[PDB]
Design a protein around this ligand. Structure first.
Ligand SMILES: [Zn+2]
Ligand SMILES: [Zn+2]
Lengths: 145, 39, 49, 292
RNA sequence: ACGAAUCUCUUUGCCUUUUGGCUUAGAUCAAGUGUAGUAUCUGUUCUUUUCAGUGUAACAACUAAUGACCUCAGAGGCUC
């Protein structure tokens, strides 16, 4: 304990501090890996001549479409290339499975009563009411069809 | 602005040329010091 | 009275004006850029004159 | 590489004359003077009974890029300083070679980690490329203020009296002193002439030279030395009116003297730099009037 | 309706200062009546100051410093 303290006095803090993933920065790190994976797959599809500008705009459609899936609004872009639209719909459903299964897993925690954070109760409250109304809107369309 | 995505990740090329510190971490203490070999 | 410099905000802060801060020289090629550098140095000293 | 490191570059004249030297290696000793980055400090002593530790001040990367030793930082061949080395190569290749050093701590560390040679370190550490330039050094050896009211001051400068034996004075007036010819060189020439060497112990002579006015004066204690200073000077110049003046004789130069017959002091030559330049301009005519 | 080059112009191509994350859209969406606190101005009080001792006569000190000359290795003497 003191041997780290004294060497911090004499030598200073190391500049190579690498933050481990933690409960507080898991949701951010899940997004950094997700934007990288979508960026890599779309950039291979591109025949040629794609730069830091065109890779910057395409990652918007991903962010917009995740909002549309949360809204249960169908996400259709006119003039969108069908391979890229095939890619973006895939990663949303990847993210949808993590979004839904984390919502199930935390409800089982809350019913047991075993150490759920005060913010996490409100987040799980918000995740379910998306899922319940989404299940409601699916059932309305099946009756209509 | 001031809230941005990443264009590239932090590379390990930069931390390799730094001088080390040699701070002693709790998880780098000696543990499981013997390897097991398969038959 | 000379212009005051902006003070160092940290220890290894860099005066960009004093030196070429990360001089990557052009790679040595085979075409002998000797007289061209003399004409630059003559023109660069002429410009600051 | 921290487990594969070069041996240190030290001169022969830092190590000295003895055969076996016990040297102490400290694996991260002090930090380098040049790149401010740590290294293996080697330190040693010439003999066992010596009283001076000789440390390596710079790292081996800064010592290789300049081709110098780590201890005295002189060049490994020719054993000369770096500023004089890059000047001697400048007279051979007719272009300025120079090792330039960053003032910036991020650009002292940057400039050391590159594997280049700096300045005359391409010429030196190649023995073929160094000996031929010494041969090219050898052919070089085959060549081998009109508005000022100065009239208050020139009354006090003698300028009208003669350098004879007969006046017995302490002070003298040296004019025709170039902007070269340093104050120590005139006291050494007088003390060589009298044999009163190590004069600064007894304070036998005191000399004031301006180097702007191109004039000066030297004061003696014990006036009997004044006849020794007169009699030990043989060559004199007589102005075509008269009024003979002795010549002190610094190498290739000529310095004229007249007994002041009082103590001149400081400020006799001038009390302002702009004012002193006109006294040299005043004299330049009288030197030409004395000679021609 | 085809000139060898300059300027002025139209159309294609190129898009050039041409939307840079995340989560629970990240979260929420303004007083009718009856009384306080802070700032500024205005008024009052207290505090922050010292020496002089009328007139006349007599005596002493001051208006140390500056300039110049000389000796000694800055001081000493003299004059203004
Ligand atoms: Zn160094
Ligand atoms: Zn040396």
């Amino acid at each position: 304990y003191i041997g780290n303290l004294i060497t911090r006095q004499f030598e200073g803090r190391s500049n190579e501090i690498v933050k481990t993933t933690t409960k507080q920065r898991l949701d951010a790190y899940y997004d950094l890996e997700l934007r990288n994976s979508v960026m890599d797959d779309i950039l291979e599809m591109m025949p040629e001549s794609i730069r830091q500008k065109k890779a910057r705009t395409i990652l918007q459609h991903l962010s917009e479409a995740w909002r549309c899936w949360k809204a249960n609004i169908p996400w259709d872009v006119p003039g969108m290339p069908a391979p890229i639209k095939k890619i973006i719909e895939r990663y949303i459903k990847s993210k949808a499975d993590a979004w839904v299964s984390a919502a199930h897993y935390n409800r089982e925690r809350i019913k047991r009563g075993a150490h759920v954070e005060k913010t996490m109760v409100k987040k799980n409250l918000g995740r379910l009411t998306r899922l319940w109304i989404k299940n409601e809107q699916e059932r309305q369309r099946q009756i209509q069809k | 602005t001031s809230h941005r995505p990443q264009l590239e990740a932090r590379s390990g090329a930069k931390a390799a040329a730094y001088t080390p510190t040699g701070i002693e971490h709790a998880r780098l203490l000696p543990g499981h010091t013997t390897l097991k070999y398969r038959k | 009275v000379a212009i005051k410099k902006p003070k160092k905000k940290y220890g290894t802060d860099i005066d960009y004006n004093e030196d070429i801060v990360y001089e990557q020289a052009p790679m040595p090629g085979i075409y002998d850029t000797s007289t061209e550098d003399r004409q630059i140095k003559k023109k660069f000293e002429q410009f600051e004159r | 590489d921290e487990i594969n490191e070069p041996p240190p570059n030290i001169c022969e004249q830092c190590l000295g004359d003895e055969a076996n030297i016990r040297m102490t290696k400290i694996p991260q000793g002090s930090e380098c003077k040049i790149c401010t980055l740590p290294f293996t400090l080697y330190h040693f002593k010439t003999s066992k009974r010596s009283n001076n530790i000789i440390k390596t001040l710079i790292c081996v990367r800064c010592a290789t890029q300049r081709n110098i030793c780590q201890c005295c930082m002189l060049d490994s061949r020719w054993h000369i300083p770096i500023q004089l080395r890059d000047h001697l190569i400048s007279l051979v290749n007719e272009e300025n070679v120079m090792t330039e050093e960053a003032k910036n701590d991020m650009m002292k560390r940057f400039l050391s980690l590159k594997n280049v040679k700096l300045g005359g370190a391409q010429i030196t550490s190649d023995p073929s490329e160094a000996d031929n330039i010494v041969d090219k050094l050898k052919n070089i050896l085959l060549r081998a203020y009109a508005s000022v009211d100065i009239s208050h001051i020139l009354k006090k400068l003698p300028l009208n009296e003669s350098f004879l034996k007969n006046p017995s004075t302490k002070s003298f007036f040296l004019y025709n002193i170039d902007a070269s010819i340093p104050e120590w060189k005139i006291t050494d020439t007088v003390s060589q002439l009298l044999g009163i060497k190590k004069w600064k112990d007894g304070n036998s002579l005191s000399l004031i030279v301006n180097h702007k006015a191109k004039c000066g004066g030297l004061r003696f204690q014990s006036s009997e030395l004044g006849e020794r200073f007169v009699s030990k000077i043989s060559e004199t110049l007589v102005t075509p009116k008269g009024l003979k003046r002795g010549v002190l004789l610094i190498d290739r130069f000529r310095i004229f003297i007249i007994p002041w017959s009082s103590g001149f002091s400081a400020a006799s030559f001038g009390t302002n730099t702009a004012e002193n330049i006109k006294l040299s301009l005043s004299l330049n005519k009288l030197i030409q009037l004395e000679l021609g």
